[PDB]
Design a binder for these strands. Structure first.
Lengths: 100, 203, 34
RNA sequence: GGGGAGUACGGUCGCAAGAUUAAAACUCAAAUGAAUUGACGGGGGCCCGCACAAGCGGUGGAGCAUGUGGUUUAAUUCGAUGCAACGCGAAGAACCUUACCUACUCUUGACAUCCAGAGAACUUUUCAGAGAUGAAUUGGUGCCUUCGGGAACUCUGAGACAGGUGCUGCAUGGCUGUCGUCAGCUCGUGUUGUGAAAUGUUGGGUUAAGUCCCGCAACGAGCGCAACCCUUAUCCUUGUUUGCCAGCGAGUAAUGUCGGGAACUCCAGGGAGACUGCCGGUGAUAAACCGGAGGAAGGUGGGGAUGACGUCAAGUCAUCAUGGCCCUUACGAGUAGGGCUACACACGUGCUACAAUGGCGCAUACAGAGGGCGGCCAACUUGCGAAAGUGAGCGAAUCCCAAAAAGUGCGUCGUAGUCCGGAUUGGAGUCUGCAACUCGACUCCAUGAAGUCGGAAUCGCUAGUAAUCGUGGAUCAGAAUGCCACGG
């Protein structure tokens, strides 16, 4: 990736751990069946104001050794390309080629 | 075209460079840790003849093994302390001598890589390696240097093979390694294969 | 397997996990006194 | 020397056609002979592949989905282009992603090292703004002690530097497609030839196979073939829970429910088995071939993995890396809203149809494989329903996803634009998310388009295959007609 595209995601990860409690709490008012409709609106209002990048939805899982946005695999944290190169070198434990 | 020699033989005759059980959560972190450790150790042990960093994780720790031609050059406290930092877990570091360091594909390529960065004849470097190996008792060896060779405007790929290198035989104990000589013309790849005899009986 | 396209070209890896129960680096022990 | 040219002019000869004698200017750096290696031939011989034939089901036609082109657009980022690009990179574009566009913003910078100085970090809470940011507002101000010190983080300043999904894949590495899992591709030594080279590697049989056997100026060897690996067929041995339940007794509305069992299914570690080994025939007593016995399995048992040397300056500088080039108050950086989803249309790949071997309602049966913690979500209640309350269990042979569907049983439709088909649209919602207008999925209600088996042409398939039927997974907040996989 571009170094900025990597940087954008560090920031996002920082901004999600920061506001998790607050966001989650707000959201858990825009919901509560036996809440107040008036207070419901105030919860909606505060969640418009929190940094957008504090939404976890706004994170794109990226390759840890490069920063490839596509082709990701969660188990490893790498793109296909890096998963493979790691596996072949014997650097992912347990993971070999498979036939059946 | 061709499968990775270490890849296909993992489990058959080729051990793993990483041995730790993780559940999915940890698995991807452990992997990123290992990369940082490797990237660090490699970047520090540039003039220590490094081949292979084996990263165990015995419970909540990280044991490294710098297999090296130069246990002397390896300092160790600083490495141990540095790894322990990156991993964030009480790290050990063990050392293993590569006894015959010219029958190690990684070093052999690293050698040729250095030599090509110092402006040596690619045929000279390639050929000396083949001979040293076949003398020290390689059952065979291939070396393929690929790039702008002697700074040619067109990239080509020359390779010399002596002995057997039976890549389709899985019981064959083949050591493979890519190196890269970075030069004024560009990158120059050094693939090295070294056949050290079929292992009957499995891993 | 390809850095770019070539979609039909593909490697398939597995991680098998073995699990043994005994009822009195790489192995994950989990003792359960019930 | 090759062209000029056996030509011009002159002479001679001829009825003529023309013959014969025979230049030059100019021009080119060759023209040429023989032989060698390849490639090619609408040359020959011999062989193989779902190559054709034989079949079976498709595409082409419809509506949708998806990709591409074209066009449009402020932008519709960039790449992939016969085979071998076109459901491809992308294993999942509302924002983010994002590379593009418009607008607002910043230049030692979003990101990095160095240096100096200041401030712990951080924490509220607030105004302005689309937001980035900027100015105000409180709490906290710890570590490590040389104690002007360690760190570390924050901020500002300095210039070195940073940054670039900018260009070059025709400078590269790495990776990949392709011939094709085709049976080839070569070397040493010896021999032959002035030599390029040849021989080996050809020839007689044979094989899936340069597979093997004989011949033979070749003798050996290497990379390929095969084997070694995974899986699947059957058996044994070790063990027995979270799986099992034969024989066991006791229950429950039913439950392997539960005592108990270790039998069996199964799970998983270790072994056994298939070798043309055996018999008969055939052939050169060769290789091998045809057939038979035993056997779960027969001649490579089935499937997978494994891709020789190279070919296409094939693909990828946008995964990454990298030579050079270029940009550095901008080709770097932040943000907000658009866009990649546009559409006169063309094509590629799909999905669903056109119906009775069917639809429809009801009743009832048999799977495999996989996934799951900010996850999978039982039960209950509520709702027509999406779901919502709400509440267990489960990091899993335990709990959950979870229902198999084709099938079978009995009705109904009565063969048509229908009890086919499902588009489109109106309306009412649920859910995810800061946010579903552009541009999500889902539900309900209604609406019920095209289509009545598809020209030329063309694609896939030789067996648990095709066809058909559901099922799971990655990516993933949400979004699968694609993809990977699983069984009937």
């Amino acid at each position: 990736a571009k170094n900025s595209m990597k940087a954008r995601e560090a920031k996002r990860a920082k901004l999600v751990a920061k506001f998790a409690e607050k966001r989650s709490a707000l959201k858990a008012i825009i919901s509560d069946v036996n809440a107040s409709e008036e207070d419901r609106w105030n919860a909606v209002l505060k969640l418009q104001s929190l940094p957008r990048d504090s939404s976890a939805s706004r994170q794109r899982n990226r390759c840890n050794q490069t920063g490839r946005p596509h082709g990701y695999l969660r188990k490893f944290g790498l793109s296909r390309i890096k998963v493979r190169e790691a596996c072949m070198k014997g650097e992912i434990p347990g993971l070999r080629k498979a036939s059946w | 075209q061709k499968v990775h020699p270490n890849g296909i033989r993992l489990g058959i005759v080729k051990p793993w460079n990483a041995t730790w059980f993780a559940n999915t959560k940890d698995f991807a972190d452990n992997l990123d840790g290992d990369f940082k450790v490797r990237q660090f150790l490699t970047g520090e042990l540039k003039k220590a003849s490094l081949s292979r960093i084996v990263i165990e994780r015995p419970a909540k720790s990280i044991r490294v093994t710098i297999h090296t031609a130069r246990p002397g050059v390896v300092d160790v406290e600083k490495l141990r302390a540095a790894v322990a930092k990156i991993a964030g877990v009480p790290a050990q570091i063990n050392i293993a001598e590569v006894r015959k360091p010219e029958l190690d594909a990684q070093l052999v390529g690293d050698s040729i890589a250095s030599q090509l960065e110092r402006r040596v004849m690619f045929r000279r470097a390639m050929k000396r390696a083949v001979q040293n190996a076949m003398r020290l008792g390689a059952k065979g060896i291939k070396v393929e240097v690929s790039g702008r060779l002697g700074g040619a405007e067109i990239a080509r790929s020359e390779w010399y093979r002596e002995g057997r290198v039976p890549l389709h035989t899985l019981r064959a104990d083949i050591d493979y390694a890519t190196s890269s000589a970075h030069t004024q013309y560009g990158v120059i790849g050094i693939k090295t294969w070294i056949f050290k005899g079929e292992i009957l009986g499995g891993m | 397997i390809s850095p770019h396209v070539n979609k039909k070209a593909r490697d398939q890896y597995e991680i098998r996990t073995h699990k043994r129960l005994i009822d009195i680096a790489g192995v994950d022990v989990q003792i359960s006194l019930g």
